[PDB]
Amino acid sequence: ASQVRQNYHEDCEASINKQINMELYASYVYLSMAYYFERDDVALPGFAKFFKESSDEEREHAQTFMKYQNKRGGRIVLQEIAAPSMREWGTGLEALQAALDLEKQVNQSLLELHSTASGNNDPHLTKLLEDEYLEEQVDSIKKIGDMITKLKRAGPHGHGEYMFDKELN
Amino acid sequence: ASQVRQNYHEDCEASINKQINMELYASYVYLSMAYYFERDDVALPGFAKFFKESSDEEREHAQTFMKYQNKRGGRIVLQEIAAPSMREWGTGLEALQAALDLEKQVNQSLLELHSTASGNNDPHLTKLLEDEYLEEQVDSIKKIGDMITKLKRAGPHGHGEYMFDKELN
Amino acid sequence: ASQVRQNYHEDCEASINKQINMELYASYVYLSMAYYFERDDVALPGFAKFFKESSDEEREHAQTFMKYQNKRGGRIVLQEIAAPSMREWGTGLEALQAALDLEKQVNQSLLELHSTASGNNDPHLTKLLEDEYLEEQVDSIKKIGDMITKLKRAGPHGHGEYMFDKELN
Amino acid sequence: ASQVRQNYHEDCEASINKQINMELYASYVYLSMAYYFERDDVALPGFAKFFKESSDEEREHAQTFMKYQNKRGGRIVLQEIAAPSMREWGTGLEALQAALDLEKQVNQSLLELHSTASGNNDPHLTKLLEDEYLEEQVDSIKKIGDMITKLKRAGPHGHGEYMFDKELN
Ligand SMILES: [Fe+3]
Ligand SMILES: [Fe+3]
Ligand SMILES: [Fe+3]
Ligand SMILES: [Fe+3]
Ligand SMILES: [Fe+3]
Ligand SMILES: [Fe+3]
Ligand SMILES: [Fe+3]
Ligand SMILES: [Fe+3]
Ligand code: NI
Ligand code: NI
Ligand code: NI
Ligand code: NI
């Protein structure tokens, strides 16, 4: 085995590889959304900026897990990254609703990975998930929830969507 | 009695203790409102900021009376602080209407305390009420009145409430 | 339910509302102590400063839980804040002994809330309690213990209390 | 009469002349105390500084009334300034107790002058007394009360008086 590996269970190693793929998928969904909102017939630069930054964050989440895998002596296995579920995302509100669903699926996966770590008595891994991932996720879900509520108040279509979009820009 | 006490009547001492409780109550009502407006299903950061600052001010009003009580040789008696009348405050307009009512009840209490001070010929206390409390109160009532009028013009629901909220932020 | 709520159990939600009330109560006890030590017949400005700052901290503890409740999609329920147990706190040593007891009751409550979170497998909440509350509490108990020992050495009455009070100022 | 005099009653004019004399007397008492505490067999520089500054303040109080008399068109009548009641003031505590008594006699006189102004419906004069004199007096009485309590805790004789004196220095 790896000269560094200690108290690192093969189920946790595999779970992190799966989570790496899921973070990359989320990054690619947000990339899709970002450029969707730069179409000449959509033209919502605030939403475009928001989802470009979210896409960058999700890739950084994947890279931190990849670093973590090496840190513990596990081995990174990269799998294909699925095409995003949609090619066109609808309104700003529909994109945020899609993002909220995705963030909660990722949160579900992170909490399941915490349970795996915890059942294998790996406090280094539960600590990683708590400090680096679980709060970022809860904060992100609250933020997107806030945005959905604000957009519904502002608009959520037409004039109000235009003005809300400037808030994000 | 206190070595410092001079021309300080027991009815004024008791009236200030009651006013201390009322200021703290107002601070707690505004604290309630502040975090109500940070709910993911409310999300009005301008209102939240406005009522957080108002809550801080009301606690400062209470502390200034507590300092005053000691300054005159009276003795602070702290009583329980009632729960705020509501747990959920409705729209921004409804919260401002509630604040306006509360500010006028506090103003009524301050004017009654001025009458007590005046009937007991305590010019140090009437001067305190005039310089430190009565104008802050009249200015606050005018401000909240202005905000209600502006919000009714802007909205007061939906799109206009969203845009008015940015004014406060 | 809240659009943001995920893995947030109703017993944890209720426990946080109770803890919010308890933090506010502790803030109000310390407010009482702070101004007690500014009485013309007490006049211990070091103790007064110490308990004013402690009162501010406890309100900040309450506000952080209120923010946390919203962050997770729970709903803040505010209850009446009990009057402090005493109106007059005795010597500086007696106030510190009272503070030590209160800090340990709060610590007990925080540890019980950690057990609730842990039994409901809420690692986001156990992480909150560990990083934001449990160390602040242990550090505060050590500090107050140190102060009690120092005051007993310095005095704890009369001349030594006067000189110890300058340490705090 | 004076070309400027308006709504200025002769009883208020005379009362201010008497108060001018009383402020000067208080300044001279404090001058006495100040240099008493610089005797080679007393040597309390903190008390000496405190009473020098108090003596300066009391002369400034007299000069402000003299300015006020001219401002209203009254005429300053200066009378002899009595010798201080003592030549030797005892301990620091005894001097503070003497100062507290004197400050309260001055406060009594100021409140009587406010009643005179008020009975003659002179709001310019009641406002002068409130803003320029009555709070300075209440603050001074609280300060001296605090000092007496602190000195009694610190000492009030011997070692503790020596150490308390450094607080004032
Ligand atoms: Fe992620
Ligand atoms: Fe995020
Ligand atoms: Fe107030
Ligand atoms: Fe106000
Ligand atoms: Fe606390
Ligand atoms: Fe603490
Ligand atoms: Fe004076
Ligand atoms: Fe003075
Ligand atoms: Ni659609
Ligand atoms: Ni309603
Ligand atoms: Ni006792
Ligand atoms: Ni003597």
The answer as to whether A78 is a domain residue is yes
Give the DSSP per-residue string, A81-119: PPPPS-S---SHHHHHHHHHHHHHHHHHHHHHHHHHHHH
The span from the CA of C142 to the CA of C151, in Å, is 14
Q: Which of D153, D128, D129, D143 is nearest to D54 (CA)?
A: D143
What's the gap in Å between D90 CA and the centre of ligand 12? Answer: 5
Q: Say which of B2, B31, B35 has its CB closest to residue C70.
A: B35
The answer as to whether D5 is a domain residue is no
In this structure, are residues B71 and D139 in contact, taking their beta carbons and an 8 Å threshold? yes
The answer as to whether C100 is a domain residue is yes
* Residue B70: closest C-alpha in chain D: D142
Q: Which of D37, D27, D142 is nearest to D92 (CA)?
A: D37
In this structure, are residues D109 and B7 in contact, taking their beta carbons and an 8 Å threshold? no
Angle at A141 between CA B37 and CA A114, to 5 degrees: 130
The span from the CA of D9 to the CA of D12, in Å, is 5
The rounded Cα D69 to chain-centroid distance in angstroms is 18
- DSSP symbol at C8: -
CATH at residue A15: 1.20.1260.10
| Burial bucket for residue A45 (CB in 10 Å: 0-12, 13-18, 19+) | middle
The span from the CA of C165 to the CA of C38, in Å, is 13
Q: Is A154 helix (H, G, I), strand (E, B) or coil?
A: helix
The span from the CA of A161 to the CA of A156, in Å, is 5
Which H or E run contains C43? none
Question: Which chains, if any, share at least 3 CB pairs under 8 A with chain D?
Answer: B, C
The answer as to whether B4 is a domain residue is no
Q: Report phi then psi at B81, rounded to 5.
A: -100, 115
CA–CA min distance C26, chain D (Å): 27
In A, which residues are within 8 Å of B158 by CB distance? 153-154, 160
Q: Is D1 helix (H, G, I), strand (E, B) or coil?
A: coil
Query: Considering every ligand atom, which ligand is closest to the CA of D59?
Result: 7
Give the DSSP per-residue string, D115-168: HHHHHTT-HHHHHHIIIIIIHHHHHHHHHHHHHHHHHHHH-SSHHHHHHHHHHH
The answer as to whether D68 is a domain residue is yes
In this structure, are residues D12 and D116 in contact, taking their beta carbons and an 8 Å threshold? yes
The answer as to whether A128 is a domain residue is yes
What's the gap in Å between C63 CA and the centre of ligand 6? Answer: 14
Total length of chain C: 169
The answer on whether C103 is annotated among ligand-binding residues is yes
Q: Does C75 touch chain B (CB under 8 A)?
A: yes
The span from the CA of D78 to the CA of D56, in Å, is 18
Asked if A touches C (at least 3 Cβ pairs < 8 angstroms), the answer reads: yes
How much of chain D is helix, strand and coil, in % rounded to 5? 75, 0, 25
Q: Is B72 helix (H, G, I), strand (E, B) or coil?
A: coil
In this structure, are residues D93 and D148 in contact, taking their beta carbons and an 8 Å threshold? yes
Q: Which of D59, D113, D53, D102 is nearest to D81 (CA)?
A: D59
Sequence-distant (6+) residues with CB within 8 A of A67 are none
Preferred mutation among C18, C25, C31, C67 to probe B, highest tally of B CBs within 10 A: C31
Tell me the sheet residues that pair with C81: B81
The span from the CA of A136 to the CA of A168, in Å, is 19
Q: Which of D26, D84, D35 is nearest to D59 (CA)?
A: D26
Token pair belonging to C155? 């005095």
* Method in brief: X-ray
**Domain total in chain C:** 1
In C, which residues are within 8 Å of A131 by CB distance? 127, 131
What residues of chain B, 106 to 145, have a C-beta less than 8 Å from chain D? 121, 123-124, 126-127, 131
The span from the CA of C71 to the CA of A131, in Å, is 16
The answer as to whether B1 is a domain residue is no
The answer on whether C136 is annotated among ligand-binding residues is yes
Count CA within 13 A, CB hemisphere, residue B96. Answer: 24
The span from the CA of D33 to the CA of B137, in Å, is 45
Taking CB atoms within 8 Å and a gap of at least 24, the contacts of A82-86 are: A82/A25, A82/A28, A83/A28, A84/A28, A84/A29, A84/A32, A85/A29, A86/A32
Host domain of residue A120 = 10-168
The answer as to whether A73 is a domain residue is yes
Q: Taking CB atoms and an 8 Å limit, are C43 and D149 in contact across chains?
A: yes
